[PDB]
Design a protein around this ligand. Sequence first.
Ligand SMILES: [Cl-]
Ligand SMILES: [Cl-]
Ligand SMILES: [Mg+2]
Ligand SMILES: [Mg+2]
Ligand SMILES: [Mg+2]
Length: 297
Amino acid sequence: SLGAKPFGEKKFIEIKGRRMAYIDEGTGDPILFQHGNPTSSYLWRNIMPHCAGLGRLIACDLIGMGDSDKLDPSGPERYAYAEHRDYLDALWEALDLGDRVVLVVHDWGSALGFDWARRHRERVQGIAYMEAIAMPIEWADFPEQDRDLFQAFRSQAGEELVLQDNVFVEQVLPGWILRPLSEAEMAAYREPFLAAGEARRPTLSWPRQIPIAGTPADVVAIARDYAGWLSESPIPKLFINAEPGALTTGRMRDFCRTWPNQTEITVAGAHFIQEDSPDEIGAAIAAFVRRLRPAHH
Ligand SMILES: [Cl-]
Ligand SMILES: [Cl-]
Ligand SMILES: [Mg+2]
Ligand SMILES: [Mg+2]
Ligand SMILES: [Mg+2]
């Protein structure tokens, strides 16, 4: 259903000196749901129940996000892609996932998940993805009505907009959900970012990492690599397309449509489509996992 309640209570694991928080419910091979910016495990709360009984249902909070600890010192050089990957790779190893992982990914969760999959291909049973960063893009490929704001995040305006005014949480997030959120839902997204200043740095460092027009060159190379791999990989894929969508539209959507061994649905939503159409999304993920894990009841 819709609903504001979280899916379970979080656990944590010590990673590199820091607590990393995660949901972990049920038994079996993992179904691993990975949020991006400026969200947390809470993004999946209404989708995960659809997979009840089908696996170990796991949703990790990225470093500095949700209930995972903040990094200190923090500043403009903190919370880049490579650092998030170093923490997340460590958490995923610590979780003892084995070799039949189904990835379920969104936004920066997709860039991280796709790269992890390229580097651990035998361990990935299926990939379900939506509103993903599936390849490097140009500014012409970015949603038109948000283009100037994202240029501003990437400029020196970003610190005031994000660290002081919290605009990614307060404006971008609800602006990319079709329905109005309740105060409880907003509170859950606000929670890790209540404090002004560096507590909010992950929500600013992230737009500064998006591979657009060849910069930053390091993440562009990473995304070029996973794009090239996915476009030829025989791993079963579930593309959860959205209308109107936001990022996975135009050129990127056409590219995703070339990927092999893939099935597709389309749901209503912009970017944070989990908030508009969670039951349809969950139902599709459940059908996908049932195909991948035939139980013959
Ligand atoms: Cl971002
Ligand atoms: Cl660069
Ligand atoms: Mg501690
Ligand atoms: Mg906290
Ligand atoms: Mg477009």
